[PDB]
Amino acid sequence: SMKYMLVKADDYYFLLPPKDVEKIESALKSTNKAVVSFFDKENNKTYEFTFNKDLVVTEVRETDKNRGIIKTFSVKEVKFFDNKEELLEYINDLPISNDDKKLLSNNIDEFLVVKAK
Amino acid sequence: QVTLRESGPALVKPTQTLTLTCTFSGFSLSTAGMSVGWIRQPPGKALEWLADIWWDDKKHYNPSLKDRLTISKDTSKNQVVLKVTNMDPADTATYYCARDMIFNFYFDVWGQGTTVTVSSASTKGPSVFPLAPTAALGCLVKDYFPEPVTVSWNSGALTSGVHTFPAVLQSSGLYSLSSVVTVPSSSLGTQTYICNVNHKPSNTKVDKKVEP
Amino acid sequence: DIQMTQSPSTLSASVGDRVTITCSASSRVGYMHWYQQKPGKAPKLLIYDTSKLASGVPSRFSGSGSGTEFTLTISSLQPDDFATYYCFQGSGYPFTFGGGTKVEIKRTVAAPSVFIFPPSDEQLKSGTASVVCLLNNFYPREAKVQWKVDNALQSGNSQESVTEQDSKDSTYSLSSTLTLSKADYEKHKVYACEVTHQGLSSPVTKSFNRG
Ligand SMILES: [K+]
Ligand SMILES: [K+]
Ligand SMILES: [K+]
């Protein structure tokens, strides 16, 4: 059993891989609030996500190298998925390019950031 | 492996509607990411993509065939149907279906393609005449419509030296082609040589023995 | 709409040469995809995602590029590599191909073997005579077939069909059909086929006499 997550903040979409989601699920079993840092390999950018106990994301921000804020986003939508299929169906309907749908479909494992088209 | 086969008419009267059927195997259009598309190629021209359908029932079409393309799927029958209205001679082409995936926006596997000719003329079966005689012999498939025609030699057991030439369009309006093979000159009169001509548009099958 | 200019349009190289084809897109593209189509057959995916070999495709093929400039390369060109090659993009609808690149194999010169066939009696019953001339395997592609009836040059009553380059010995084959009525055919005796080719030091004529 796994849980996939997709977060739309500003006009960007953020894909959260299952393994990370399970780590947050365990952390929130033991605490009330979680601040997770996510590394975007492709663009070499770092982002800090704040989750409540209900696993919605409260705030999204772009971080520097000393956990510093460069840009703040407004969370618009948070969506959860029980299997890869429902994730793929959402991706195909996402307002992204085929090159972005190709990336999200092949890399469930990594923190991925794509832009709205 | 993954197989796709297209089927449809070889002859379509102008302004009528062409209906093609792609029957596939080795995959399901219900599996997520899976897709199937249609691509056509007029005689001696570059490939043109036509349409595609996805597992989520999303359909895309080439804006050039406006108001003329319609695609549907029957996952139970494992087939996809493409309908092209108001057929026209410029639409005479070989039509190909192929598989695509959200994971890879390219067609990894293709069907053999079906030739479709838009013409008011009716279907005419071919007449096969012997090309009697290292020696060369052959078969003359003449006066047929429309393309294609397939010619085999001894049910494919004879492959070396066989040349099936491209068809030429005679002034009559009918096609004609020859198929030759070079064999040891001593094997004449001793070895049997039969050509297997097949013109599926006319459901004609001829097996002519060529002899000195 | 992403349009794609493929270059060159035609190319002739010897076996073992290194062949390079270029695809220039009208806008930036994430990945380029290459297909090889032998004549009359359906396309076969050669290189995917710009530089990835499809499964079962020989290591002789490779691809390179980025943005709007992409290339397909054949390290050692083999005789079976005769085809038309197409660059394809799936980055944006509508999906578009390139114009194609015809790759012909250059080999040593070879002379045509000439055969002549008289019309069958079966076709003569119906009142039409079809005399056929075969040029068999020869290189290069260029060849002249001249029809001669009782030593009279014929024009306008013949049709020729050349085979695609053979994917094993890189040769071509030509067939010429001279169509006459049964009235005209039975008014002349000698039917000849004169063939001029680079590999022939002198034109070769094969003939027959009615009967
Ligand atoms: K919200
Ligand atoms: K269905
Ligand atoms: K070309």
What ranges do the domains of chain A cover? Answer: 4-115
Q: Contact B11/B123 with Cβ under 8 angstroms?
A: yes
Q: How many A from CA of A77 to the centre of ligand 1?
A: 5
Q: Per the omega criterion (within 30 degrees of 0), is the bond before C140 cis?
A: yes
The one-letter code for the residue type at A16 is L
The verdict on B37 and B99 lying in the same domain is yes
Give alpha helix (H) positions in chain A.
18-30, 84-93, 98-106
The verdict on B11 and B80 lying in the same domain is yes
Strand-pair partners of B36? B53, B99
Q: Contact A21/A3 with Cβ under 8 angstroms?
A: yes
Say whether residue A66 is in contact with chain B using an 8 A CB cutoff.
no
Q: Buried b / exposed e across C83-102, counting CB within 10 Å, b at 16+?
A: bbbbbbbbbbbbbbbbbbbe
Structure token pair of residue B197: 């001509």
Kind of pairing between the strands at B93-101 and B114-118: antiparallel
Say whether residue A22 is in contact with chain B using an 8 A CB cutoff.
no
Q: A 85-104 residues with CB below 8 A of C?
A: 97-99, 102
Structure token pair of residue B104: 């890879």
Burial level of C142, CB count in 10 A (0-12/13-18/19+)? exposed
Q: Contact A16/A28 with Cβ under 8 angstroms?
A: no
Q: Contact B117/B147 with Cβ under 8 angstroms?
A: yes
Domain boundary among B120, B142, B159: B120
> How large is the angle between the packed helices A84-93 and A98-106, nearest 10 degrees?
170
**Closest by CA position to B80, among listed B132, B150, B24:** B24
Q: Contact C161/C145 with Cβ under 8 angstroms?
A: no
Longest dimension (CA), chain A: 40
The verdict on B17 and B104 lying in the same domain is yes
Structure token pair of residue B118: 């838009």
Fill in the DSSP letter of residue B205.
E
Tell me the three state secondary structure of residue A117.
coil
The verdict on B48 and B150 lying in the same domain is no
Say whether residue B168 is in contact with chain C using an 8 A CB cutoff.
yes
The verdict on B58 and B98 lying in the same domain is yes
The verdict on B81 and B173 lying in the same domain is no
Kind of pairing between the strands at C19-29 and C61-74: antiparallel
The dihedral formed by the CA atoms of C4, B40, B61 and B70, expressed in degrees to the nearest 10: 170
Burial level of C139, CB count in 10 A (0-12/13-18/19+)? buried
The verdict on B64 and B152 lying in the same domain is no
Rg (CA), chain B: 20
Cα–Cα distance for residue pair A105/A117, rounded to 1 Å: 17
Tell me the three state secondary structure of residue A22.
helix
Query: Which among C49, C93, C132 has the least Cβ separation from residue B131?
Result: C132
The verdict on B31 and B82 lying in the same domain is yes
DSSP states of A24-45: HHHHHHH-S-EEEEEEETTTTE
Q: Contact A101/B35 with Cβ under 8 angstroms?
A: no
Is the Cβ pair A102, B105 closer than 8 Å? yes
The verdict on B108 and B74 lying in the same domain is yes
Cα–Cα distance for residue pair C43/C30, rounded to 1 Å: 22
Q: Which residue has the tokens 């009696």?
A: C121
Domain boundary among B92, B120, B148: B120
Q: Which residue has the tokens 């959200």?
A: B102
Is the Cβ pair C31, A99 closer than 8 Å? yes
**Closest by CA position to C152, among listed C190, C201, C99, C185:** C190
Domain boundary among B120, B140, B162: B120
**Closest by CA position to A56, among listed A89, A34, A87, A83:** A34
Residue B19: CATH number of its domain: 2.60.40.10
Domains and CATH numbers, chain C: 4-106 (2.60.40.10), 115-209 (2.60.40.10)
Say how many CA atoms lie within 13 Å of B176 toward its Cβ. 22
Q: Phi and psi at residue A25, in whole multiples of 5°?
A: -60, -40
Q: Which residues of C touch A98 (CB under 8 A)?
A: 90-93
Domain that holds residue B149: 121-211
> CA-based angle B150:B154:B160, to the nearest 5?
85
Q: How many CB atoms lie within 10 A of CB C147?
A: 20
The one-letter code for the residue type at B111 is G
Structure token pair of residue A14: 């953020």
Fill in the DSSP letter of residue A92.
H
The verdict on B79 and B144 lying in the same domain is no
Contact partners of C by the rule of 3+ C-beta pairs under 8 A? A, B
Is the Cβ pair B102, A93 closer than 8 Å? no
Structure token pair of residue A65: 């190298």
Residue to substitute from B6, B61, B140, interface C, most C β-carbons within 10 A: B140
Structural domain count, chain B? 2
The verdict on B105 and B134 lying in the same domain is no
Say how many CA atoms lie within 13 Å of A102 toward its Cβ. 15
Say whether residue C67 is in contact with chain A using an 8 A CB cutoff.
no
Strand-pair partners of B116? B93
Q: How many A from CA of C65 to the centre of ligand 2?
A: 39
Cα–Cα distance for residue pair B49/C96, rounded to 1 Å: 6
Q: Which residue has the tokens 């593209």?
A: C29
**Mind telling me how many Å the CA of B14 is from chain C's nearest CA?**
25
Q: How many CB atoms lie within 10 A of CB A46?
A: 18
Cα–Cα distance for residue pair C149/C147, rounded to 1 Å: 7
Cα–Cα distance for residue pair B100/B39, rounded to 1 Å: 12
Cα–Cα distance for residue pair A51/A28, rounded to 1 Å: 9
Q: How many CB atoms lie within 10 A of CB B94?
A: 21
**Closest by CA position to A57, among listed A6, A113, A99, A106:** A6
The verdict on B37 and B87 lying in the same domain is yes
Give the per-residue SS3 of chain C. Answer: CCCEEEECCEEEEECCCCEEEEEEEEEEECCCEEEEECCCCCCEEEEECCCEECCCCCCCEEEEEEEEEEEEEECCCCHHHCEEEEEEECCCCCCEECCCEEEEEECCCECCCCEEECCCHHHHHCCEEEEEEECCCEECCCEEEEEEECCEECCCCEEEEECCCCCCCCCECEEEEEEEEHHHHCCCCEEEEEEEECCCCCCEEEEEECC
Cα–Cα distance for residue pair C191/C187, rounded to 1 Å: 11
Specified resolution (Å): 2.9
Q: How far is CA B113 from CA A44, A116, B18, B38, C90, in A?
A: 46, 37, 15, 10, 21
Structure token pair of residue C87: 């660059």
**Closest by CA position to B163, among listed C82, C165, C110, C104:** C165
